[PDB]
Write a protein that binds this ligand. Structure first.
Ligand code: KAN
Ligand code: MG
Ligand code: MG
Length: 175
């Protein structure tokens, strides 16, 4: 239960600060489904970019530290667990992940992890990131756990919507 216990600790500390945080990536899939479906390599979080200091304070207060600074965000470690953190920026009516489809950070808690309601990135935002991944690593070459998580997200959003979103991504990044 270590990752779930950590997620609950991180979100309790964020709630106390009125700091919204969105579960992303694998755990966001499981949160929207309301079921734990696999072992997760890390915990992905999306945070208000202008409030980054408050997230780092939560990390430090849990005994962790910022471990690596990335082009898109940062990685922090709390004990043996990894947090993969990406900023979202206020766009008049909601926070949005840069370059992602609108609605990437919904206001309402739309997922559940071990009985706790949680904010989590939208299905479109989740799936969008696999498109980047497919440009970096041929899907035929993906580790099976990513093929399976992608297919689960696609089943949940629906093939029609996914085909449309993929086409939008291709048009966005077409030469
Ligand atoms: N919004 C724009 C950004 O969107 C994607 O970035 C995503 C990262 O790729 C994810 O991180 C993954 O990749 C890391 C580096 O390989 C791994 O350490 C990590 N465990 C993986 O989950 C992270 N969780 C979400 C983030 N949206 C693109 O790729 C990036 O170019 C683009 O600027
Ligand atoms: Mg992850
Ligand atoms: Mg990750």
């Amino acid at each position: 239960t270590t990752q779930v216990t950590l997620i609950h600790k991180i979100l309790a500390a964020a709630d106390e600060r009125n700091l919204p945080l969105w579960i992303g990536g694998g755990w966001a899939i499981d949160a929207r489904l309301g079921r734990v479906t696999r072992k997760h390599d890390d915990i992905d979080l999306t945070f208000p970019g202008e409030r980054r200091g408050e997230l780092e304070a939560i990390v430090e207060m849990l005994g962790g530290r910022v471990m690596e600074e990335l082009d898109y965000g940062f990685l922090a470690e709390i004990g043996d667990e990894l947090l993969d953190c990406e900023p979202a920026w206020w766009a008049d009516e909601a926070y949005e992940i840069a370059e992602a489809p609108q609605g990437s950070c919904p206001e309402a808690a739309e997922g559940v992890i071990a009985g706790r309601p949680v904010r989590c990135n939208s299905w479109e935002a989740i799936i969008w990131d696999y498109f980047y991944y497919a440009d970096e690593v041929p899907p035929v070459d993906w580790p099976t756990k990513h093929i399976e998580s992608y297919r689960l997200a696609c089943t949940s959003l629906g093939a029609e919507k996914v085909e449309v979103l993929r086409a939008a991504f291709r048009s966005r990044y077409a030469a």
